Structures are given as structure tokens and as C-alpha cells.
Amino acid sequence: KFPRVKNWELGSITYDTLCAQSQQDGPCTPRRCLGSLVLPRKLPAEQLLSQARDFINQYYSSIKRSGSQAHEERLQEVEAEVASTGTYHLRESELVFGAKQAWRNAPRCVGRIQWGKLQVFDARDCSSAQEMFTYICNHIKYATNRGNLRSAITVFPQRAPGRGDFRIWNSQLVRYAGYRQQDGSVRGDPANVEITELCIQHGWTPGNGRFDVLPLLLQAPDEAPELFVLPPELVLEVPLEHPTLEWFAALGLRWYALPAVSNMLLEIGGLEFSAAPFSGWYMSTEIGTRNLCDPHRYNILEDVAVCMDLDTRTTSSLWKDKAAVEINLAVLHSFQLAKVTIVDHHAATVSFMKHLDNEQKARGGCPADWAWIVPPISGSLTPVFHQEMVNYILSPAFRYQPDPW
Amino acid sequence: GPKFPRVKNWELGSITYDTLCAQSQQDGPCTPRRCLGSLVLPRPAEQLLSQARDFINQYYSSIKRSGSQAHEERLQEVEAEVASTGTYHLRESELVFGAKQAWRNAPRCVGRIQWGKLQVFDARDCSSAQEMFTYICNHIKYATNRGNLRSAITVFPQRAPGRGDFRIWNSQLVRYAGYRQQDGSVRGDPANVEITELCIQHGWTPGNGRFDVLPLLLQAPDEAPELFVLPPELVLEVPLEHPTLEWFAALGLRWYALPAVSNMLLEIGGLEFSAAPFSGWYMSTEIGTRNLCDPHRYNILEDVAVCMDLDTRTTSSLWKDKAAVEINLAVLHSFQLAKVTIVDHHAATVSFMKHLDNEQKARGGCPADWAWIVPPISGSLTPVFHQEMVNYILSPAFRYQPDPW
Ligand code: HEM
Ligand code: HEM
Ligand SMILES: Cc1cc(N)nc(COC[C@@H](CN)OCc2cc(C)cc(N)n2)c1
Ligand SMILES: Cc1cc(N)nc(COC[C@@H](CN)OCc2cc(C)cc(N)n2)c1
Ligand SMILES: C[C@H](O)[C@H](O)[C@H]1CNc2nc(N)[nH]c(=O)c2N1
Ligand SMILES: C[C@H](O)[C@H](O)[C@H]1CNc2nc(N)[nH]c(=O)c2N1
Ligand SMILES: [Zn+2]
């Protein structure tokens, strides 16, 4: 049965028929819904061959060459290669198509209106951690573009049965160190305590600030990972100030321009790319709300509230809500002043609604994870709060994978 | 680990396993292939007896007499009563237990810390629409308690074979009229256009303000509903003012004190109580964010932002977030001044976390609907945002039921 999908603000209804193309189970069953879980609990040639075929058909259908001689030959090549070797390789154009499709298919991404605009760097001819680093630098340079951010993905060599994976150990290309204190607390970003320690242990001389950019740990197959410091000119950062509260800059806050996820696996036609870092630009609440105000992150709400002279003694003064708004405002203002691409949560969710509509017409649905699409402040002030969403796994897909240590 | 859903709190790093979901006898709308968790409404003989037996088992467990002679005799009583009449009836203490458990079971309610403290009015002797009105007036008086609100449910006679249902047509005991205008817009609450026009069709002389309290449409078995005006002195309202924005009072906004849901079905041991209105006290975001700021409700955000002199021509000023905060603050401040019970979304979610811990120890889990539990402003500023939740249906339950017309 196909799900009826209602928008509660507009009263309009659609039917999701795309979910029928799902070949992979999510975490839910009729007995209990596990939609709010962040990670999956659970984290032969004929099965590879059927994923490969399905993906090749997706590709030829996308270039409107479905059933062509080019199409049939390509399927025979894939078939001949799997049968002899247990695996196959993608053509660059297939890889490019596959990577845009994985982004398109990502249920947690609110930025999917952009999905067709993705620079794909083919790095499958990489043979060493040293080469990975060079590719990573070029990616950063290209994606940053002096503040005019451009979406990009770099795809390192696929996993192969006989050997270790290419991996970037860091969860993002740009991350701030978190230094555990003898007295339990953390200096820097508490989310990065473990990777910070791994870096030091692999030879990095640590800093002692709140915002020390981490080096990269890059791993070529079956080798210890190697440490690479990113050249500071590569990492564009925006100092945070507020349009009207002058003390705000005194807080010494800053964030980096480029959000670039580097720990996720890219799956295309049954092939798996364990190192395929991708990047776009930030939505302001990621920084203003989560990274700065989460209690297990920089946790600056109290500091800001004290500075704004708010009554911190009672929740009902809504001091938290008031401080968060100003912090988000500071992020938006500072990124705009520095001329660095950023989108606020109102503009982002409005674009996502238009994306849902485009996708309804093009594919008969759009997989979306409501808990992730709705922003972490002002939920119901955005149109996506009132929109029902169906969540399911299509391939090509970005997936979580185990930490390599 | 254990073969039960693993539930993580991402703020604290702590893990639990939900074993209570095992007690679910009723399927939700999710499958392995697609999650329908964000959908607001997803679409007897031996059947009764097994629901009855299971409920009677729950009752005897809760008073610690499982397997006792009194437990076995009640079981026998129930099957005999069904055997000869097709239905059965609850003892008074069974009803009280079942009503409390219905509330304890409600996955969408953030106020369940209070579940044990529920006044159950037994109105199973009611035989007319006039008497329903008297009971409902008594309920409102008791629950309102001049501003010191008290949780209550009033239970009218159950569905019976052949015979028509007791129904309250209104969705809440207190609702404001919504009058469709010539220009196509609505004066009052647009959520209530249909019930308003039904009240007129049944002979109510309509008012024409933004905050006209609706009469009740009450239906006794096999009769047309009858119209009842609530005496104005029984309906406590709170005029809205802001602690520092002196003009806010001039907007003439107000809300009623008592949230009293009247169109839900209370199901206990297979028995169906089609009229069983229940009330608590408000969480401030229900009024300040949803009822006043939803685009399809009072939709006041822009009017307030304009009075605050915000830049409403650009999303990136965060005018909507700033205005919503002040409206929420005005709600809290005004209820506080008026001495009417209300709870802010920070205190409420903190108490819900406490509830989750109580229920983990008491029953090994707690069914909870994340999208409904997380408040509509300041989501990740509250501890429930960082808490994974397992949603499933337990009985006794409050359930949606079709409109009687
Ligand atoms: C162009 C601007 C983009 C914006 C504004 C954006 C926005 C977002 C946001 C806000 C999230 C949730 C992040 C979080 O809370 O941690 C997200 C998740 C994600 N986005 Fe994007 N996105 C963009 C581009 C991209 C690109 C280029 C890709 C890949 C090609 C991508 C794939 C993803 C994936 C896979 C996730 C899920 C991450 C996870 O499950 O942990 N997005 N997006
Ligand atoms: C004591 C104070 C209470 C508070 C603060 C409270 C809070 C809430 C809130 C905020 C919601 C979601 C409302 C919405 O967005 O529409 C809700 C839903 C609900 N609560 Fe409560 N609650 C309280 C008492 C009660 C009582 C006394 C009962 C019944 C005995 C109850 C049963 C429910 C049910 C069944 C729902 C779900 C309704 C639906 O699905 O539409 N709650 N609660
Ligand atoms: C490409 C992109 C653009 C943009 N604006 N934002 C992002 C967000 O990146 C952070 C995402 C990437 N997995 O992190 C989500 C996450 C996942 C997990 C398992 C844990 C955690 N703390 N956070 C990515
Ligand atoms: C008892 C109680 C306490 C409290 N603080 N809040 C509530 C609010 O309940 C409103 C619920 C009623 N099912 O809202 C869901 C709903 C129902 C209807 C008919 C329309 C609508 N838009 N939304 C109820
Ligand atoms: C438990 C809950 O699912 C978890 O906190 C999720 C909620 N929604 C989110 N949404 C986004 N965009 N990013 C997140 O990290 C989360 N965290
Ligand atoms: C589409 C979505 O399910 C819908 O807007 C829900 C989201 N969460 C909610 N949460 C509560 N408490 N009340 C609501 O009415 C809603 N609406
Ligand atoms: Zn689900």
C-alpha cells in the first residue's frame, strides 16, 4: 500500500510511490517505530550483479538511452567482469551520476534542492596517504573558493575483497580539537576528544586553544594512518560578531566555512567507496544552535545569557531561547559580512519544500527524515514542520560505517 | 546485546533497552521498507474476550494479585458476562486504573510525569444530553479550580451493541469560533470553521469576535446532538500581556485556561468509551507557538514582528524566531500573573526525562512519539531532542475516532 502524505498547513495530499523502489530495510517494524534512532542497530556475486544491473539501468534511463546498444553492451561488460573477478568498475560518467543520486537520495539532507550541482573529483587512481592528502587539499581549495562555496565530492578507490579500506579517520575534513582536562572538563569541541587523542598519539603536537584545527589522519589500505596538517590558508574561518551586541565579539567565537563529511561510505551499484568526502555550505542552525549551544558541545548559552543580563534562575524567563536566537543571528551576520555562503533555516526549509514538489513530479516521492529536516530551533515556524514525510532507503546511498580504529 | 530496541541519549551518552514494546498487541503504520512516524493520522466475539482477559491481567498485576483466586474469579465473571451478553462492564476501580493507564500509554503526551494524579469521574450512569452537560460543567469546575488546575477525566457510558454512541461533537470543551468571511479569510480560529458552522446549523446565534467561546454539541444515544452554551463564568480565560513590551496588551489577545480534549475514544479491555473528555493544563508552546503562530491558526507572527519593528522582508533577520519567543514569553508571564497553572517547554521536557527514567525502572520502557514530544520552538535546547524514543501502541489507549457527522 502506498502512503498518503499530508501537508497540514496547506491541506494538500500526495501519494509516495517512490518507496516501492526501496530494496533495503530501515529500522522500523509494525510493532514499533525506530525513526528517531540516529544509527542503525546492525552497524555473493548474484546480489552484487543485481545491484550493478539496477544501477546501470538507472544510469541509461537518466541519459534517455534506455535499451540502446550502448546500454546492452555496458550490462554485458559489468556481467563479464563480475563473473570473472567478483567485482567491477564504474565509468567516470556513471560515478558522477551515482554520486549526485546518493545526495539526492539522502533522507536527512535539507539542502537537496542543489543535488544536480555537485562537482565530482574522481580520485580512484590514488595509491597512498600522501596522494589522498593532495586530493583533499584541492577539494578544500575548490569547494571554499574564497567564500563562494561550491558543493563537491572526492571519491577515493573503492573497497576490494582482498584488502583494507582507504579511510579518512576524521569525521569532517575541518574539525576543532577537544582536549580532555585532568578535572574531567573539555577545552575545545567535546565531540572531538577521541580523534584529538588519536592525532596526538600518532605524533601531532597539540595546541591548547578552544578552536585548534585538527590535522588529518589518512589511511591507505593495511597501513597505519598518516598525519597531515592542513595549511592554515586552506581553512577559511569566520570570526563571530553580533550586529548590535558589541560584547559578543569579545567572546572569541569563530567557526569554519566548510562543512565536509569524511567518515561516510558511498554505495553505488553495489560498489562501496569508504573514503569519499563531500561538502556543501552550512545552514546557520548547525553552527548557531547545535555546535555552539548543545550541552555536550561548546555549550555557550549560559555565557551569552549572562552577557545579555537575562534572568538565568528560571526556565520560564526563556533565557535559553532568547540567547539562542541572538547566537544564530550572530552566525548569519558574521558569515554575510565575511562574504561566506550560508543559508538560514527559513530559506533552507522553503527551498526543501520546493524540492519535495520537484521530486513528487520527477519520481513520485522523496525520502525524508522529519526529525532531521526540521531545524533544531523554531521548528513549527518553518513549513517542513507541517509536512508529513516518508523515510526509506534508496540506492545510490551515503551510509554510516564503523570507525577504522 | 539484548534483542530489544537499543535507545541512546546523545547528550549524556547513556543507553537503555526497551522491553515494554514486547507488550504491544497493536501494529503501528511503519514497516521495514518505510517509516511513517511523521504521519499525524495513519490510516467482536473472542476478540473482545482476549482484550478483556489481558486488561484484567494488567489490573491484577497492578494491585499485585496475579494468579490469585480473586483474579481467576474476575476472569470467569468477565467471560460469563460476555458469554451471555456479548459485552461486559468494568468495576469502578478497574475504570480508574484503565483511565490512568490510557494516559500513561499516550506516546504523544509530554505531561505523563503526572499520570498517577488523575481524577476519574465515573459518569456511566448518564442517560441524556442534558445530564452530559451537567457532568461536563462539573468537570470544568473541578478541573479549573479557579486557576489551580487539576487533571481530570469524565467517563460516559461505553459503546453498546445496536444502540447509538454518546458523543461530544466539539474537539475540545473550550474552543474559539472561526467565522468564514466574504473575502475568504477567517475571523477567530480557522481550526474551528467546521464545528462553528455545525453549531449555527443546529441553531446557535453566532457572535463575530476573534475569541468567541463555542457552545457544546452533545449527543446522547440515537438522538440528534443538542446545543449547550457554557456559562461564561465557568470558562476561565487569561488576557495576554508582555512583561516589558507595553503595547502587547493592546493586541487584545487571550487564551482559555483549560485544555480539555473531548473527541477521543478511550479504549479499555476492548470496551469503547466514545465520550470520555479529559483535561490537564497547558504547556506554553501549545498556545504561544502553535495556536497563535501557526500560519493556518491565528497566524499573528507578522503583526507582532511589525510592532517589534523587525525586518519582516528577509528571512535572515530571524524576525519570526524573535517574535515567537516574545509571544511565548507573554503567554507564560500572563498565566503567571493571572495565577493559572501553565508549564514552559523547558520545565515540561525536563519532567518528561524524569518520567522516562521512572518508566524504564517500572516497566522497562516508555512509548513516545519524538516529533510530538519535542517542542515546536527551541527543540534542541530541551533535553528530549537528544533522546531516542520508541513509539508503539499499548492498551488501554486514547484513540482517534471518526467525526460523528
Ligand atoms: C549545499 C548545501 C547543503 C546544505 C545547506 C545541507 C544541509 C544539510 C543539513 C543541515 C544536514 C543535517 C546535518 C546535521 O545536523 O549534522 C545535512 C545532512 C546531510 N547532507 Fe546535506 N546539505 C548540503 C549539501 C550536501 C552535499 C553536497 C551532500 C553530499 C553530496 C550532502 C549530503 C548530506 C548527507 C549524507 C547528510 C546526512 C549526514 C548524516 O546522516 O549524518 N549534503 N545536510
Ligand atoms: C497535566 C498536564 C498535561 C500537559 C502539560 C500535557 C501536555 C501535552 C501536550 C503538549 C500534548 C501535545 C498537544 C498537541 O500538540 O496537540 C499532549 C498530548 C496528549 N496528552 Fe497530554 N498533557 C497533560 C495532561 C494530559 C491528560 C490529563 C491526559 C489524559 C488523561 C493527556 C493525554 C494526552 C493525549 C491522549 C495526547 C495526544 C492527543 C493527540 O494525539 O492528538 N494529557 N499532552
Ligand atoms: C554536506 C553537509 C552540509 C551541511 N550544511 N552540513 C552537513 C552536516 O555534517 C555533519 C553530519 C555529517 N554526518 O554529522 C551528523 C552526525 C552523525 C552522527 C552519527 C553523529 C553526529 N554527532 N553527527 C553536511
Ligand atoms: C489534556 C491535554 C493537555 C494539554 N496540555 N494539551 C492538550 C492538547 O490536545 C490537543 C490535541 C487533541 N487531539 O491536538 C491534536 C489535534 C486535534 C484536532 C481535532 C485538530 C488538530 N489540529 N490537532 C491536551
Ligand atoms: C535522538 C534524535 O533523533 C537526535 O537528537 C537527532 C534529532 N534530529 C537531528 N537533526 C539534525 N539535523 N541533526 C541531528 O544531529 C539530529 N539529531
Ligand atoms: C507533519 C507532522 O507530523 C505534524 O506537523 C506534527 C509534528 N509534531 C507535532 N507535535 C505536537 N505536539 N503537536 C502537533 O500537532 C504536531 N504536529
Ligand atoms: Zn518508523
Per DSSP, the residues of B189-208 read -GGGHHHHHHHHHTT-----
Give Rg (Cα) of chain A. 23
Do B269 and B55 form a contact (C-beta atoms < 8 A)?
yes
Ligand nearest to the CA of A171: 3
| Residue A160 CB less than 6 A away from ligand 3 | no
Cell of A294: 548543545
CA-wise closest residue to B298 among B184, B197, B186, B173: B186
Q: What is the DSSP string of B57-113?
A: HHHHHHTT-TTSHHHHHHHHHHHHHHHHHS-----HHHHHHHHHHHHHT-TT-TTGG
The C-alpha cell that represents A54 in the structure block: 539496477
From the list A237, A85, A107, the residue with the least C-alpha distance to A174 is A237
d(CA B222, CA B31): 40
C-alpha B338/C-alpha B146 separation (Å) is: 10
User: Which string of b and e fits B184-204 if b means at least 16 CB within 10 Å?
Assistant: eebbbbbbbeebbbbbeeeeb
Tell me if A315 and B31 make a contact (CB, 8 A cut-off): no
Q: How many residues does chain B have?
A: 405
DSSP A71-116: HHHHHHHHHHHHHHHS-----HHHHHHHHHHHHHT-TT-TTGGGTT
Integer Cα distance of B188 and B209 in angstroms = 7
Measured by CA distance, the residue closest to atom 11 of ligand 6 is B372
Q: Is the CB of B257 under 6 A from ligand 4?
A: no
Please state, in angstroms and rounded to a whole number, the distance separating the CA atoms of residues B268 and B252: 43
CB-based contact B34 A19, cutoff 8 Å = yes
| Alpha-carbon separation of residue A288 from A55, A103, B349 (angstroms) | 39, 24, 22
Nearest to A305 by CA among A289, A325, A291, A319: A319
Active site residues of A: 109, 112, 281, 286
Going from the Cα of B279 to the center of ligand 1, the distance in angstroms, rounded, reads: 41
A36–B370: do the CB atoms touch at under 8 Å?
Answer: yes
Displacement of CA B61 from its chain's centroid (Å): 27
**Residue among A41, A317, A324 minimizing CB distance to B381:** A324
Q: How far apart are CA A311 and CA A347, in angstroms?
A: 32
H or E segment and range at residue A70: helix A69-85
Kindly determine whether residue A32 and residue B392, on different chains, have CB atoms separated by under 8 Å.
yes
Q: Does the beta carbon of A371 sit less than 6 angstroms from any atom of ligand 5?
A: yes
Beta-carbon contacts of residue A80 (< 8 Å; ≥ 6 apart): none
Neighbours of A59 (CB within 10 A): 24
Pull the grid cell for residue B270.
476492548
Active site residue B109: yes
User: What is the C-alpha separation between B70 and B67, in angstroms, rounded?
Assistant: 8
CA atoms of A37 and B108, how far apart (whole Å): 17
C-alpha triplet B149, B153, B155: angle, nearest 5°: 155
**3-class DSSP state of B132:** helix
CA distance A248 to A292: 13
Please tell me the distance from the alpha carbon of residue A5 to that of residue B391, in angstroms, as a whole number: 19
Phi–psi pair at B7, nearest 5 degrees: -120, 120
Question: What single-letter amino acid sits at B68?
Answer: S
Annotated binding site: which residue ranges of A? Answer: 28, 33, 36, 109, 172, 281-282, 286, 291, 371-372, 385, 400
All domains in chain B, ordered by first residue: 18-124+151-161+265-279+349-373 (3.90.340.10), 125-150+165-236+400-404 (3.90.440.10), 237-259+282-347 (3.90.1230.10)
> Quick one: A311 exposed, middle or buried, by C-beta within 10 A (0-12, 13-18, 19+)?
exposed
Across the beta sheet with A119-122, what order do the strands follow?
A119-122, A152-155, A278-279, A260-261
Q: Which of A9, A193, A321 best probes binding to B when mutated, by most B CB atoms within 10 angstroms?
A: A321
What DSSP string describes A268-299? ETTEEES---EE--EEHHIIIIIIHHSTTTT-
Q: Which residues of B touch A295 (CB under 8 A)?
A: 11
3-state secondary structure of B239: strand
Alpha-carbon gap, residue B300 to B291, rounded angstroms: 9
Bridge-based pairing of strands B265-268 and B397-399 is antiparallel
Alpha-carbon dihedral sign for residues A313, A317, A320, A325 = negative
Please name which of A234, A216, A237 lies closest in space to residue A226, comparing C-alpha atoms: A216
User: Is B247 labelled a binding residue?
Assistant: no
Instruction: Please tell me which residue in B74, B104, B112, B167 is annotated as part of the active site.
Output: B112
Query: Is A33 close to B328, i.e. CB distance below 8 A?
Result: no
Ligand 5 and B142: CB distance under 6 A: no
Q: Which residues pair with A155 in a beta bridge?
A: A122
Mutate to test the interface with A, among B8, B10, B36 (most CBs of A within 10 A): B36
Chain B residues within 8 A of A328 when measuring between CB atoms: 318, 321
CB–CB of B6 and A41 under 8 A? Answer: yes
How many beta carbons lie within 10 A of that of residue A63, not counting itself? Answer: 12
Alpha carbon of A397 to ligand 7 centroid (Å): 19
Residues 6+ away with beta carbon under 8 Å from A73: none
> Distance, CA A397 to ligand 6 centroid (Å)?
28
User: Do A305 and A319 touch, CB atoms closer than 8 A?
Assistant: yes
**Cβ atoms A297, A176 nearer than 8 A:** no
Q: Which amino acid is at A209?
A: G
CB contact at 8 A, B158 and B265:
no
CB-facing half-sphere around the CA of B325: CA atoms within 13 A: 21
CA separation for the pair B173, B117 (Å, rounded) = 21
Greatest CA span in chain B, whole angstroms?
73
Q: Report whether B282 belongs to an annotated binding site.
A: yes
Cell of A140: 578544500
All three cell numbers of B275: 465520550
Ligand 2 proximity of B189 Cβ (cutoff 6 Å): no
- In this structure, the residue with its CA closest to atom 9 of ligand 6 is B372
Q: Ligand 5: which of A372, A374, A377, A384 to mutate, most ligand atoms within 8 Å of CB?
A: A372
Phi, psi at residue A33, to the nearest 5°?
-85, 125
Q: Indicate yes or no: CB of A33 within 8 angstroms of CB of B34.
A: no
Q: Which residues are within 8 A (CB) of A220 and not within 5 positions of it... i.e. 6 or more apart?
A: A127, A128, A129, A132, A166, A226
Instruction: Pick the residue from chain B with its C-alpha nearest to A38.
Output: B388
Mark residue A360 as left, alpha or beta (left: phi above 0; alpha: psi -120 to 50; beta: remaining).
Answer: alpha
Residues 6+ away with beta carbon under 8 Å from A176: A188, A189, A192, A210, A211, A212, A213, A214, A256
> How far apart (Å, rounded) are the C-alpha atoms in residues B265 and B171?
11
The amino acid at residue A13 is I
Please give the DSSP secondary-structure letter assigned to residue B290.
I
CA A355 to chain centre: 18
Asked if B192 and B207 count as a contact pair (C-beta separation under 8 A), the reply is: no
Best interface-test mutation with A: which of B34, B283, B284, B326 has the largest number of A CBs within 10 A?
A: B34
* Rounded distance from Cα B271 to ligand 3 centre (Å): 48
In this structure, how many other beta carbons lie within 10 angstroms of the beta carbon of residue A42? 6
The burial of A46, by beta-carbon neighbours within 10 Å (0-12 exposed, 13-18 middle, 19 or more buried), is given as: exposed
Asked if residue B30 has its Cβ within 6 Å of ligand 4, the reply is no
Angle separating helix axes B46-62 and B69-85, nearest 10 degrees: 160
Distance CA A13, CA A390 (A): 13
Closest-CA residue in chain B for A375? B379
Please state, in angstroms and as integers, the Cα–Cα distance from residue B33 to each residue in A348, B42, B317, following that order: 28, 16, 41
Residues of chain B with C-beta less than 8 angstroms from the C-beta of A389: 38
Helices H / strands E in chain B, number of each: 11, 18
H-assigned helices in A115-173: 129-144
| Identity of residue A103 | W
The reply to whether residue A370 touches residue B37, judged by beta carbons under 8 angstroms, is yes
Among residues B363, B267, B272, B268, the alpha carbon closest in space to that of B55 is found at B268
Distance CA B337, CA B241 (A): 9
Q: Counting every residue, how long is chain A?
A: 405
Ligand number nearest to the C-alpha of A114: 1
**Contact (CB, 8 A) for A231 and A243:** no
Query: What is the sign of the dihedral through the CA atoms of B101, B105, B108 and B114?
Result: positive
C-alpha A386 – ligand 7 centre gap (Å): 17
Question: Quick one: which H or E segment has residue A318?
Answer: none
Identify the residue whose cell numbers are 532507503.
A393
Q: Are B188 and B211 in contact (CB under 8 A)?
A: yes
Q: What are the distances in angstroms from CA A400 to CA A24, A37, A394?
A: 14, 13, 14
Q: How far is CA B210 from CA A222, B206, B214, B216, in A?
A: 71, 12, 11, 18
* Cα dist from A67 to A50, A76, A77, A269, whole Å: 17, 13, 15, 18
| Ligand 5 contacts CB of residue A370 (under 6 A) | no
Contacts of A378 (CB under 8 A, 6+ apart): A345, A346, B320, B321, B324, B377, B378
Cis amide linkage into residue A402, ω under 30° from 0: no
Peptide-bond breaks in chain B following residues (C–N over 2.5 A): 43
Ligand 2 proximity of B280 Cβ (cutoff 6 Å): yes
**C-alpha B194 chain-centroid distance:** 20
- Mind telling me how many Å the CA of A344 is from chain B's nearest CA? 6
One-letter identity of residue A204: W
First to last CA, chain B: 51
Q: Note the maximum CA span of chain A.
A: 73
List helix spans (H) across B202-289.
284-285
